Tab-separated table of C-alpha atoms in Angstrom:
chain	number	residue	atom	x	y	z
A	1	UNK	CA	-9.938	9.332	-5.278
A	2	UNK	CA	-7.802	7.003	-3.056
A	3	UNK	CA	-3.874	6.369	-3.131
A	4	UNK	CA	-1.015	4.198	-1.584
A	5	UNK	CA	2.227	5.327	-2.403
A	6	UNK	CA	5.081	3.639	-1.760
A	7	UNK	CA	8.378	4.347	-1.346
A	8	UNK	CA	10.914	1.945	-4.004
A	9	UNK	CA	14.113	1.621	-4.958
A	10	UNK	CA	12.967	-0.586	-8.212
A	11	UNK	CA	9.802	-2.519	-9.442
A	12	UNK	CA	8.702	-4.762	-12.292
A	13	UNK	CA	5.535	-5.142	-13.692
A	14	UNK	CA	4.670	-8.132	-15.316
A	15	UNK	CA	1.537	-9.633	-17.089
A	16	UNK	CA	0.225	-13.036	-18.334
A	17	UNK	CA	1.497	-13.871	-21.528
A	18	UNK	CA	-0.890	-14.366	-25.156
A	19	UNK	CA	-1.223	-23.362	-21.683
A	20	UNK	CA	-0.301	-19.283	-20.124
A	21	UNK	CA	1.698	-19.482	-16.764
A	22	UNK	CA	4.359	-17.016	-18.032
A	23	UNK	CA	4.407	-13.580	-16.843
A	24	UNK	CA	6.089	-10.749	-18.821
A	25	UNK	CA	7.619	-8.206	-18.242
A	26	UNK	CA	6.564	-5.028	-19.281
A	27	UNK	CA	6.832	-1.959	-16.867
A	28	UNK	CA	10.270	-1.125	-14.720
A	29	UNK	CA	11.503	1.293	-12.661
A	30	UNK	CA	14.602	2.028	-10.627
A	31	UNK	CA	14.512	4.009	-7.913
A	32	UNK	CA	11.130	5.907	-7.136
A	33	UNK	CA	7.265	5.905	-6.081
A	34	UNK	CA	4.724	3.395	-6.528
A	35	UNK	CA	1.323	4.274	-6.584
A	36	UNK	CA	-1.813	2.434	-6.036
A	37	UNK	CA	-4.540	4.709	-7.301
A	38	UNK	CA	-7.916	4.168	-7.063
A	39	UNK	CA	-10.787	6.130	-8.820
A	40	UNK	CA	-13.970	6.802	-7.819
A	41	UNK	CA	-17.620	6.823	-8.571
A	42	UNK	CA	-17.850	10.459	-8.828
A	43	UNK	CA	-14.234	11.540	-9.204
A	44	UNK	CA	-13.819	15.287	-11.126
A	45	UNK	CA	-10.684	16.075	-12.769
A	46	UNK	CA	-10.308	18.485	-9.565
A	47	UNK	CA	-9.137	15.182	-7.201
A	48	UNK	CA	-7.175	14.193	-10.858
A	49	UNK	CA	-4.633	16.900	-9.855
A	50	UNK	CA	-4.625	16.520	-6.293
A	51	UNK	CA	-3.517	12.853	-7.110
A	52	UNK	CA	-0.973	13.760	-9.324
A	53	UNK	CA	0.370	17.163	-7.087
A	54	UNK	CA	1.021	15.119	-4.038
A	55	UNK	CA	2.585	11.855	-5.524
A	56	UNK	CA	4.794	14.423	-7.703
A	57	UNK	CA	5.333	17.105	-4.961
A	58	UNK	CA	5.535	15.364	-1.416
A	59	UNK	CA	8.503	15.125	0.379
A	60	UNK	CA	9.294	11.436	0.954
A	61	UNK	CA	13.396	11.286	0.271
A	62	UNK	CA	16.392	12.634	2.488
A	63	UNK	CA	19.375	15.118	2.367
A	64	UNK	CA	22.763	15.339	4.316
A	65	UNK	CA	21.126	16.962	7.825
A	66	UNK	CA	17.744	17.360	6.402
A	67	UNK	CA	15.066	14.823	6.209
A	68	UNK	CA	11.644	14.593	4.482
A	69	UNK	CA	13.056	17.397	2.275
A	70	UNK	CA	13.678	15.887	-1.564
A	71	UNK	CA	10.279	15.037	-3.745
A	72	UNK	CA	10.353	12.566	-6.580
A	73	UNK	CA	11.472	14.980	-9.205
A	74	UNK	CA	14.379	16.759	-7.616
A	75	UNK	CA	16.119	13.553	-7.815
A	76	UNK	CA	14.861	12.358	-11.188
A	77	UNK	CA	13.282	9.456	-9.887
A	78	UNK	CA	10.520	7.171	-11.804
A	79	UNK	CA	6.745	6.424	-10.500
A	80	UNK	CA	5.111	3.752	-11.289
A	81	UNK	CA	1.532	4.446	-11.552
A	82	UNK	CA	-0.698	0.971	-11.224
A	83	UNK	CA	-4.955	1.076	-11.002
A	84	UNK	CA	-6.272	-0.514	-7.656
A	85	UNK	CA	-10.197	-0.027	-7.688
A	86	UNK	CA	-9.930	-2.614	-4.741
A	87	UNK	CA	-9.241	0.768	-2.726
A	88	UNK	CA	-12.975	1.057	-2.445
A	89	UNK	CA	-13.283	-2.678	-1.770
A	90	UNK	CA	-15.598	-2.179	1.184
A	91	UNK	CA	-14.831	-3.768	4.472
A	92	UNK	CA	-17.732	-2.304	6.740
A	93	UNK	CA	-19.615	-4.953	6.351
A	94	UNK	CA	-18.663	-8.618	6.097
A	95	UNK	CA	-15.656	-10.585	5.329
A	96	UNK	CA	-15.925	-10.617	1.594
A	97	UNK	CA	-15.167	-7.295	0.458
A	98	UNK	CA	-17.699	-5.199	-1.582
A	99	UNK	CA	-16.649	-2.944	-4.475
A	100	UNK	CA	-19.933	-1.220	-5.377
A	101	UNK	CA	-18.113	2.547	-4.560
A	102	UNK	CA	-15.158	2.242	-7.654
A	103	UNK	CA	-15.810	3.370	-10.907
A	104	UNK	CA	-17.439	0.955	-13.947
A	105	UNK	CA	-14.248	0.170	-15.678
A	106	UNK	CA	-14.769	1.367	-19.462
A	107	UNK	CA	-15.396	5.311	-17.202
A	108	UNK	CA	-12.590	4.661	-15.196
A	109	UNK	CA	-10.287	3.054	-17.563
A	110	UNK	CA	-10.482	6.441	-19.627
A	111	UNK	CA	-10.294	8.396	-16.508
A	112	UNK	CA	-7.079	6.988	-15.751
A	113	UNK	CA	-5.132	7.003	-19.056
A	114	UNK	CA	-6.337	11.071	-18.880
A	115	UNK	CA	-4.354	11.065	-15.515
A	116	UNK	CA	-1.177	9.155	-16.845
A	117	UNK	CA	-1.036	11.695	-19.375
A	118	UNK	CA	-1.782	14.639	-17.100
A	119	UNK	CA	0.946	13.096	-14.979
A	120	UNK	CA	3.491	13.427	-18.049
A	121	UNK	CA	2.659	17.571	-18.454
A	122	UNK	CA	3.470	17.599	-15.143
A	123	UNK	CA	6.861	15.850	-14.738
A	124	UNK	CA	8.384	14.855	-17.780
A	125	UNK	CA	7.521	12.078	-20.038
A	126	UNK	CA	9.948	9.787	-19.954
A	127	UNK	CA	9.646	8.823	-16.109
A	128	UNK	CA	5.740	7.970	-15.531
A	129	UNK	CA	5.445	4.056	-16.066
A	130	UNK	CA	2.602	2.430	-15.950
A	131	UNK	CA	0.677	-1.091	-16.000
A	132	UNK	CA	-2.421	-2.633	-17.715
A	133	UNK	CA	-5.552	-1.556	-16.908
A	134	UNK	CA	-7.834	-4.193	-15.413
A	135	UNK	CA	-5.459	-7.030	-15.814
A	136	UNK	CA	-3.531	-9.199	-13.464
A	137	UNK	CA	-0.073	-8.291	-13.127
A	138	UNK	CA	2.070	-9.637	-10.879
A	139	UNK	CA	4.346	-6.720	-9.202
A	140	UNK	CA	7.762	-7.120	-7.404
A	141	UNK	CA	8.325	-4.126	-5.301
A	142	UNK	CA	11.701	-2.853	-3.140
A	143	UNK	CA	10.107	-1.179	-0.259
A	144	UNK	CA	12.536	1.516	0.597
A	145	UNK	CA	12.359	2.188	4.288
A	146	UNK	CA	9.114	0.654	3.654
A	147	UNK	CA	7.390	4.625	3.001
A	148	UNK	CA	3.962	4.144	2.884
A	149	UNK	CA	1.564	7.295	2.161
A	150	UNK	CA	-2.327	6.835	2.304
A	151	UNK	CA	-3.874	9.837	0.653
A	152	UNK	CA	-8.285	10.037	0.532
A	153	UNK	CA	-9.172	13.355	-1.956
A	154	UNK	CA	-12.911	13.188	-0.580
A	155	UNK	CA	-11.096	14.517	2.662
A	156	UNK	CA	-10.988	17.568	1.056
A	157	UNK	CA	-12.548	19.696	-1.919
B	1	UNK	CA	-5.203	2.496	13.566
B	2	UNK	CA	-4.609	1.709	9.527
B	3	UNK	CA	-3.302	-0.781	7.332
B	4	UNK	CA	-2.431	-1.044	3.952
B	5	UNK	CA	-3.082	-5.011	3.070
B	6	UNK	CA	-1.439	-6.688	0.296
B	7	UNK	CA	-1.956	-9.626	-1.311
B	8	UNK	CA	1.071	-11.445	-2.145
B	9	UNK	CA	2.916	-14.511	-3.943
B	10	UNK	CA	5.808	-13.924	-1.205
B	11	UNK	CA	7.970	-10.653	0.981
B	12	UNK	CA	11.256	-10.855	1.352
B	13	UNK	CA	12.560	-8.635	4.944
B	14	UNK	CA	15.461	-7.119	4.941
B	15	UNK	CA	17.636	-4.898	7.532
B	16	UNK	CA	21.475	-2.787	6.771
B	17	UNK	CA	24.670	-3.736	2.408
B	18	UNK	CA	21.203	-5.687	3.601
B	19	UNK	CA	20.774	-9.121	5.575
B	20	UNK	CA	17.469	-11.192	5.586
B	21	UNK	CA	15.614	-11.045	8.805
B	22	UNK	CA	12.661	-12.361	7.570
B	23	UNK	CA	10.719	-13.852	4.501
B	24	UNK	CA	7.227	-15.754	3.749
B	25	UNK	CA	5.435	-17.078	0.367
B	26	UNK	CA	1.957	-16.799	-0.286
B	27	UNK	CA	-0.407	-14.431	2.531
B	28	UNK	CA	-0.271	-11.000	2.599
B	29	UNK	CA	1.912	-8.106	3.963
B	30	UNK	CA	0.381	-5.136	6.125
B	31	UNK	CA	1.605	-1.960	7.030
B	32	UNK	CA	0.022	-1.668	10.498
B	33	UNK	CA	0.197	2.316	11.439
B	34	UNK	CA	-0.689	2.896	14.838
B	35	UNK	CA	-2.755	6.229	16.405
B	36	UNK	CA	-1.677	7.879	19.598
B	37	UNK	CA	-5.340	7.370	20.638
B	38	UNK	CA	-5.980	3.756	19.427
B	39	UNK	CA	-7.591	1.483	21.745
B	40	UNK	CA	-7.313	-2.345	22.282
B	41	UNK	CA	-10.423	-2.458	20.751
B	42	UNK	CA	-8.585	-0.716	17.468
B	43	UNK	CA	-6.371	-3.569	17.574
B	44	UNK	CA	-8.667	-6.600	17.268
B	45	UNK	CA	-10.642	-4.594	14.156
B	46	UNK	CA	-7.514	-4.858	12.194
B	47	UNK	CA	-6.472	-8.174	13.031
B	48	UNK	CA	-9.427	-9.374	12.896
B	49	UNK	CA	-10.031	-8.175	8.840
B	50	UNK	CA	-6.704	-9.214	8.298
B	51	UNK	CA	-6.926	-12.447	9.259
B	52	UNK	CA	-10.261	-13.191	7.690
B	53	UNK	CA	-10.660	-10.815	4.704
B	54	UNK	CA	-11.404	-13.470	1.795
B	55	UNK	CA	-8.959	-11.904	-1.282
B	56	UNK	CA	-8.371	-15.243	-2.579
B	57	UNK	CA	-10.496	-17.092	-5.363
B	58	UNK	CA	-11.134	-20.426	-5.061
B	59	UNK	CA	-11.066	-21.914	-8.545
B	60	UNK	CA	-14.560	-20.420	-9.878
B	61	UNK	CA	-15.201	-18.443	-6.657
B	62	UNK	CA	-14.037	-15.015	-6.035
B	63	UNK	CA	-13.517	-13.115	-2.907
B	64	UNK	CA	-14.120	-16.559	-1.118
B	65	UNK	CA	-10.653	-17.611	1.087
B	66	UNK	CA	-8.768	-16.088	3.956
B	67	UNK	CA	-4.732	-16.171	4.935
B	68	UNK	CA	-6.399	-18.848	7.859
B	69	UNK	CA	-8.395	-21.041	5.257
B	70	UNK	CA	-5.453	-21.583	3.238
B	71	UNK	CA	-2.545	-21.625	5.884
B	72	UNK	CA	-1.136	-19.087	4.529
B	73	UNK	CA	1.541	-16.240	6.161
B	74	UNK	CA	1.182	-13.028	7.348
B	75	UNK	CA	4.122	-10.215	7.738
B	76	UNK	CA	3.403	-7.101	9.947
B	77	UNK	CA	4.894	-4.350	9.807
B	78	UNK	CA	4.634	-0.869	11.215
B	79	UNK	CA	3.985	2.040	8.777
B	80	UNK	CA	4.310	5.420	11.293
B	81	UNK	CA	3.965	7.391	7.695
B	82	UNK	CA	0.557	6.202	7.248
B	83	UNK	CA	-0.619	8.757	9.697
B	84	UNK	CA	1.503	11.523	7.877
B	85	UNK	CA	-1.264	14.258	7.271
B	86	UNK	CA	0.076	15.876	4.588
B	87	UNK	CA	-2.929	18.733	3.428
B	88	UNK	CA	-0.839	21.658	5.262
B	89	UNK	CA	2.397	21.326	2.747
B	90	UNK	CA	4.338	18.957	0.836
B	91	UNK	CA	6.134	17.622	4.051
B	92	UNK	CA	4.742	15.048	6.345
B	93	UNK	CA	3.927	15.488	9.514
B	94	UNK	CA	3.055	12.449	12.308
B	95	UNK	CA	1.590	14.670	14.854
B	96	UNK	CA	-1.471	12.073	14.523
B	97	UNK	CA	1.092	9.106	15.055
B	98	UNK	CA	2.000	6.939	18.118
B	99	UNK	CA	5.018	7.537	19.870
B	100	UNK	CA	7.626	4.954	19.407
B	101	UNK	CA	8.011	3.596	22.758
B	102	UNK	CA	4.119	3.322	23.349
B	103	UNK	CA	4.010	2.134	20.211
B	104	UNK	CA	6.610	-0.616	20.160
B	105	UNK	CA	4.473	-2.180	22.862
B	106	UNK	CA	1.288	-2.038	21.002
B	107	UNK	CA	2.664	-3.646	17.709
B	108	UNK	CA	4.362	-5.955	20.438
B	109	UNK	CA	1.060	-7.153	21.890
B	110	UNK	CA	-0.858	-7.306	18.552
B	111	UNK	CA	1.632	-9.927	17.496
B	112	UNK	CA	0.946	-11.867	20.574
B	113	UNK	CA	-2.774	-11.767	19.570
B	114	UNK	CA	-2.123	-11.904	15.737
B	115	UNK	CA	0.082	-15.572	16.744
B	116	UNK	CA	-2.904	-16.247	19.735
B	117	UNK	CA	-5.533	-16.368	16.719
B	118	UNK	CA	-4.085	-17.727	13.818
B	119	UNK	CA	-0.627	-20.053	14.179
B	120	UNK	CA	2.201	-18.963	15.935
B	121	UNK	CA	4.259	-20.029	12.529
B	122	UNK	CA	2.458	-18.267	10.756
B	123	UNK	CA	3.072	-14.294	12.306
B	124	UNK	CA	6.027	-13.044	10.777
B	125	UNK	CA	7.910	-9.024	11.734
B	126	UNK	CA	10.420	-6.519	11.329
B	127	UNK	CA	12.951	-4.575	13.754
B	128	UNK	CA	10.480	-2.102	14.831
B	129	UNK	CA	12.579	1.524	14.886
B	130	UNK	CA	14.785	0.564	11.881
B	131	UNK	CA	15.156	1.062	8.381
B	132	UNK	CA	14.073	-1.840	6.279
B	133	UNK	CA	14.231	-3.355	2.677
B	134	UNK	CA	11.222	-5.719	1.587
B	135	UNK	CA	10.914	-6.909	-1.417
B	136	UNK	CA	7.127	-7.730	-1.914
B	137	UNK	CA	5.697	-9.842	-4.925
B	138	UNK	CA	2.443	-8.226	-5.329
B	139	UNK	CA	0.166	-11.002	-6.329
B	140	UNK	CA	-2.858	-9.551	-8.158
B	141	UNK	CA	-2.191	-6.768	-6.845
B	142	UNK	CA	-4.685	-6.531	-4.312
B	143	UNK	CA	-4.246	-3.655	-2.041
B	144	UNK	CA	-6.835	-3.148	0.591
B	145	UNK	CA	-7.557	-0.033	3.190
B	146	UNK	CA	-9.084	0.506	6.691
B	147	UNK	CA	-9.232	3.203	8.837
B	148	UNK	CA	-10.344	2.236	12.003
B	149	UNK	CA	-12.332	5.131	12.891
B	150	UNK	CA	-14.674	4.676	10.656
B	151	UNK	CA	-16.452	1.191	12.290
């Protein structure tokens, strides 16, 4: 499994609507992390909680002297957790990028909902947002420093 | 050398209370990070994909159009934290990234070659060392990563 996680001081989520052109709104959050996560293939639950222990453990936020020192919970900050199986888009070979490596998305779309809840027993409910699997959305992101954290879990096991 | 490409309707650049710096619509941000042992070879892999990588449909296609194809824009900027290993602890550490002085002159001269291949107009940056604010309207999204030592 395959994360970007960026560093935000707000971001809104918003989807197409029921003529469409009108994006909605339905995911904010104030200050926080973004996170682009990206499941794969043969994924077990054990990269699951690597995912989820570095996005909610790492030290990406600053006190008085001390830098990299504050995760997202210490300062009761939100994450907004968005699906990006283009993560494994392929770019080896050729221009056009190949996505044979993500998951098929009826495996992957349960996968990930498991994970969003996993990621609530793990912080607390009322800060893991979310957007809609598979779907266009249309994000506007504050890029706080910009903070940008790549993490791959088949780099470890 | 990495990037993290995104696809996006527009960025919006900020530096310190903020002031503008830089903006562009449609094209596609990247956070550039730079290795202590990248080559000018790692360079022209990166601009390269960014500057030809086809993320945009084109009305029944998909996966079809490049940044170039459409005259689009392209804002680089450079992500040091992208090398932050961060398997020992909880805390980053850039031990793999490029010092800052080295560094500002490779970001420097990838601009050159970024403008030097696509349009001059069309390059857009940051202050290198300095804190920043970009608001990003990720279009899709479509988020897209390389590794260079992997070609």
């Amino acid at each position: 499994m395959r994360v970007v996680i960026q560093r935000v001081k707000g971001a809104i989520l918003s989807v197409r609507k029921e003529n469409e052109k009108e994006l909605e709104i339905i995911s904010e959050i104030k200050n926080g992390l973004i996170c682009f996560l990206g499941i794969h293939k043969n994924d077990t639950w054990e990269d699951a909680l690597y995912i989820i222990r570095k996005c909610l453990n790492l030290r990406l936020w600053n006190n008085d002297n001390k830098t990299w020192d504050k995760n997202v919970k210490d300062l009761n900050y939100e994450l907004l957790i968005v699906s990006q199986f283009t993560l494994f888009g392929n770019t080896k070979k050729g221009n056009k990028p190949d996505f044979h490596l993500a998951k098929e998305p009826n495996e992957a779309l349960i996968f990930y909902n498991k994970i969003i809840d996993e990621f609530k027993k793990q912080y607390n409910d009322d800060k893991i947002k979310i957007g809609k699997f598979g779907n266009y959305m249309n994000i506007d992101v504050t890029n706080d420093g910009p903070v940008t954290i790549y993490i791959d879990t088949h780099d470890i096991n």
